Amino acid sequence: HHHHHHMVHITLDRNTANSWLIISKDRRQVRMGDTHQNVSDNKERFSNYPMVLGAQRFSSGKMYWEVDVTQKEAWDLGVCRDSVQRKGQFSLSPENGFWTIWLWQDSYEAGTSPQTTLHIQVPPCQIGIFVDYEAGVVSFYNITDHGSLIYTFSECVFAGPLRPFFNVGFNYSGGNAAPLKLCPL
Numbered sequence: 001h002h003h004h005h006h007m008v009h010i011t012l013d014r015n016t017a018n019s020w021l022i023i024s025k026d027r028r029q030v031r032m033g034d035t036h037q038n039v040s041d042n043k044e045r046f047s048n049y050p051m052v053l054g055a056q057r058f059s060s061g062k063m064y065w066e067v068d069v070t071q072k073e074a075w076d077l078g079v080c081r082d083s084v085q086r087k088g089q090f091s092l093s094p095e096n097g098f099w100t101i102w103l104w105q106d107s108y109e110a111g112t113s114p115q116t117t118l119h120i121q122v123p124p125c126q127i128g129i130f131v132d133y134e135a136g137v138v139s140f141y142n143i144t145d146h147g148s149l150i151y152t153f154s155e156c157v158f159a160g161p162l163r164p165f166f167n168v169g170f171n172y173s174g175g176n177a178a179p180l181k182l183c184p185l
């Protein structure tokens with residue numbers, strides 16, 4: 001791909017974070033804490049899962065960013081509607097306003113309903129996310145493998161403003177404490 005020149009500076013929105021997350025001072029890194037992080041509850045926070053949104057809202061144009069997933073066992077990445085459900089249980093699907101891929105139990109899958117098997121020969125340490133709002137496209141690129149395509153959602157019904165979406169995953173195993181990091185342009 002040649003999408004790097006629509007690069008946008010993404011930062012994380014503390015107010016949307018699950019109350020166990022720790023966001024860095026620069027708002028470019030997030031990890032799971034070993035406890036509640038001593039913040040008040042609010043209607044924006046994802047309650048059930050270790051999720052957080054980007055601060056940026058997009059309703060037009062082409063946007064690209066990169067995320068470091070080094071030494072994680074589990075994570076979700078992509079974009080979602082600004083109006084997604086925050087509280088209780090839900091599935092990551094375009095019907096619920098999410099365009100995502102994930103790693104879980106040594107397999108990579110796209111968040112369709114039901115989920116789609118991905119075929120990645122080189123396990124990625126960094127993921128590129130490309131959104132074309134007018135075209136209705138969300139694409140995922142393997143930066144570790146010369147930018148090779150991972151998955152494309154097309155004919156997307158965004159149905160409102162979009163926000164960058166992140167899930168650092170649980171750490172039941174003690175093997176998933178590593179952060180998600182937004183990579184420099």
Ligand SMILES: CC[C@@]1(O)CCN(c2ccc(F)cn2)C1
Nearest residue numbers: 031069070071072176177178179
């Ligand atoms: C274990 C120390 C941390 O809590 C802080 C930094 N960290 C990692 C782990 C892996 C990796 F690739 C990058 N950062 C997790």
